[PDB]
Design a protein around this ligand. Structure first.
Ligand SMILES: COc1ccc2cc(-c3cc(-c4cc(Cl)cc(Cl)c4)nn3[C@@H](C)c3ccc(C(=O)NCCC(=O)O)cc3)ccc2c1
Ligand SMILES: CCCCCCCC/C=C\CCCCCCCC(=O)O
Ligand SMILES: CCCCCCCC/C=C\CCCCCCCC(=O)O
Ligand SMILES: CCCCCCCC/C=C\CCCCCCCC(=O)O
Ligand SMILES: CCCCCCCC/C=C\CCCCCCCC(=O)O
Ligand SMILES: CCCCCCCC/C=C\CCCCCCCC(=O)O
Ligand SMILES: CCCCCCCC/C=C\CCCCCCCC(=O)O
Ligand SMILES: CCCCCCCC/C=C\CCCCCCCC(=O)O
Ligand SMILES: CCCCCCCC/C=C\CCCCCCCC(=O)O
Ligand SMILES: CCCCCCCC/C=C\CCCCCCCC(=O)O
Ligand SMILES: CCCCCCCC/C=C\CCCCCCCC(=O)O
Ligand SMILES: CCCCCCCC/C=C\CCCCCCCC(=O)O
Ligand SMILES: CCCCCCCC/C=C\CCCCCCCC(=O)O
Length: 416
């Protein structure tokens, strides 16, 4: 146990140093402020909580529990709760990581317009409109709109259509928008000198206000053509288009400003991530801390530390992760086959870390769960020794090896 104690001490302390360093890096570099890095930071924090609790409990008990004093039992129990909380939070944030990557892979111009326009199988005022944001006519007459709809679909729809017909209209409208940009003299050079995400951001506006409607922001076009994203964002915020549809304009403007899909899907969607990563563990850990304090309030509530009963929420988090994992793979090979992306892409590089971490941590937890119930000490010491380094592994995979992080570090180094 002496060697085992030394090994997990080195593992958790090294993990803690690396995690605090990674947190200082993500927090201190403003250009790295994306949703993915906020998720990584919260994951880092959960491991920081775990490692801090482990090192503290270890200092209090192994540097016994039958005769602990009033302050000792208190600090020890608080540390035990924080340890359990950190352990469940690890897997819940790995789950959030899988969710974010999965949603990121599904994002494109199609999904973006699909979020900003929705899908209405019946005609509605936006001007009469149906399907996914498809204009019918600006004429007040309802029959005049229904006529254009029935003519466009080639049948008596009576103002009601199917989803297949709607998306069929959708693909055409996207094609027409892109051709409208390419034919335009004042829009094409701007579109050519743009990354795929911002190109989609321009196509959004063309899909909403037509070709000439976006052509009318030439003073705002030259700015993003000059890569002055900030002032372009401000001037776009000043525009009448912002006053008419602020909620959509914010997402598009931030898509121009950040060059990321972070605006999508929706604002405060991150609160769900917070609820899963921090709240969900609280839902299971708090009541069981209550049961511990009420009925098993002995020693330090000290399975090698982790509470037995808490397996199952983690199991749940792992189970869901499995289905996410599979889906992600299916998207990846799809995007690679269609050449919609390649290995230098951010989604792929994120997948390199997340798709290793999910099976690694999941299989490790399942193995731990089976071994702890065998009533085996060798397998426990080995797996826990290696598991102590997991915070270091996460910090390395999500931060230190990250291309944007290293690029920013090289840039700040080169500026000097
Ligand atoms: C697309 O699907 C997937 C899924 C899993 C994948 C897993 C690996 C892989 C190969 C190896 C390995 C290990 C040894 Cl000892 C020797 C040799 Cl020769 C190779 N490690 N790993 C993992 C451990 C890994 C390595 C780097 C990064 C990274 O660089 N992240 C940061 C990227 C960034 O942000 O720029 C993240 C994981 C590679 C592609 C993958 C692709
Ligand atoms: C290298 C050794 C540093 C780690 C020392 C902590 C060991 C803990 C202990 O055995 O009491
Ligand atoms: C190499 C660094 C290893 C340091 C391990 C001991 C850190 C101090 C401790 O937690 O006891
Ligand atoms: C018990 C301690 C652990 C619980 C602490 C939880 C408190 C919230 C912590 C971090 C909040 C992170 C919010 C960051 C928003 C960034 C959004 C973005 O960049 O897209
Ligand atoms: C300081 C870097 C910036 C990031 C801030 C993250 C918030 C820090 C949260 C907890 C810090 C505790 C780490 C030290 C624990 C030591 C445990 C021990 O000495 O036994
Ligand atoms: C940080 C404050 C926590 C320190 C409490 C240590 C327990 C005191 C004791 O063992 O008597
Ligand atoms: C709600 C969250 C509950 C988490 C547990 C909170 C505190 C547990 C540790 C306090 C125990 C104090 C005992 C001191 C004593 O025996 O005198
Ligand atoms: C209490 C534990 C943390 C709560 C997470 C949810 C916060 C939120 O809704 O943004
Ligand atoms: C007792 C509760 C058990 C819960 C089990 C959960 C099983 C399903 C969990 C996650 C499923 C997510 C699959 C994502 C498919 C998205 C489709 C797409 O990518 O377009
Ligand atoms: C360890 C490596 C495990 C899986 C790597 C899969 C890489 C597939 C992407 C190449 C195209
Ligand atoms: C993949 C690379 C793995 C290579 C070697 C793994 C070593 C496994 C040893 C397990 C020891 C368990 C025990 O001592 O009972
Ligand atoms: C270089 C960074 C590597 C640091 C730590 C890697 C250790 C990975 C731990 C995996 C635990 C799996 C297990 O044995 O149960
Ligand atoms: C235990 C071993 C821990 C770390 C060694 C393996 C890490 C190798 C990462 C290399 C990734 C790559 O080059 O693609």
């Amino acid at each position: 146990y002496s060697s085992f104690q030394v090994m997990y001490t080195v593992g958790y302390s090294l993990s803690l140093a690396a995690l605090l360093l990674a947190l200082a890096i993500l927090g201190g570099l403003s250009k790295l402020h994306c949703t993915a890095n906020a998720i990584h930071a919260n994951l880092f924090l959960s491991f920081v909580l775990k490692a801090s609790a482990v090192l503290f409990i270890d200092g209090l008990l192994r540097t016994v529990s039958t005769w602990l004093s009033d302050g000792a039992v208190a600090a020890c129990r608080v540390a035990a709760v924080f340890m359990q909380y950190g352990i469940v939070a690890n897997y819940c944030w790995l789950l959030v990581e899988g969710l974010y990557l999965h949603n990121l892979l599904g994002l494109n111009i199609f999904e973006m317009l699909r979020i900003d326009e929705g899908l209405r199988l019946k005609i509605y005022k936006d001007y009469y409109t149906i399907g996914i944001g498809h204009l019918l006519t600006k004429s007040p007459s309802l029959n005049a709109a229904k006529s254009e709809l029935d003519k466009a679909i080639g049948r008596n729809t009576n103002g009601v259509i199917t989803k297949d017909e709607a998306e069929k209209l959708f693909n055409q409208d996207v094609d027409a928008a892109v051709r409208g940009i390419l034919r335009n003299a004042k829009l094409k050079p701007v579109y050519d000198s743009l990354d795929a995400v911002r190109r989609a951001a321009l196509i959004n506006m063309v899909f909403q206000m037509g070709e000439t409607g976006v052509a009318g922001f030439t003073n705002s076009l030259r700015m993003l053509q000059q890569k002055r994203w900030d002032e372009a964002a401000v001037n776009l915020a000043k525009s009448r288009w912002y006053n008419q549809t602020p909620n959509r304009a914010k997402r598009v403007i931030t898509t121009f400003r950040t060059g990321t899909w972070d605006a999508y899907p929706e604002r405060s969607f991150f609160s769900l991530y917070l609820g899963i990563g921090w709240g969900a563990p609280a839902l299971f850990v708090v009541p069981w801390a209550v049961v511990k304090c009420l009925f098993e309030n002995v020693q330090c509530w000290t399975n090698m530390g982790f509470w037995w009963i808490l397996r199952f929420p983690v199991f749940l988090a792992i189970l869901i992760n499995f289905f996410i994992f599979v889906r992600i793979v299916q998207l990846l090979v799809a995007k690679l086959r269609a050449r919609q992306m390649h290995h230098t892409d951010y989604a792929f590089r994120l997948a390199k870390s997340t798709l290793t971490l999910i099976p690694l941590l999941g299989v490790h937890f399942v193995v731990f769960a089976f071994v702890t119930d065998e009533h085996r000490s060798a397998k426990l010491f080995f797996d826990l020794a290696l598991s102590s380094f997991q915070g270091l592994l996460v910090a390395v995979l999500y931060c230190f090896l990250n291309k944007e992080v290293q690029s920013e570090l090289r840039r700040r180094w080169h500026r000097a």
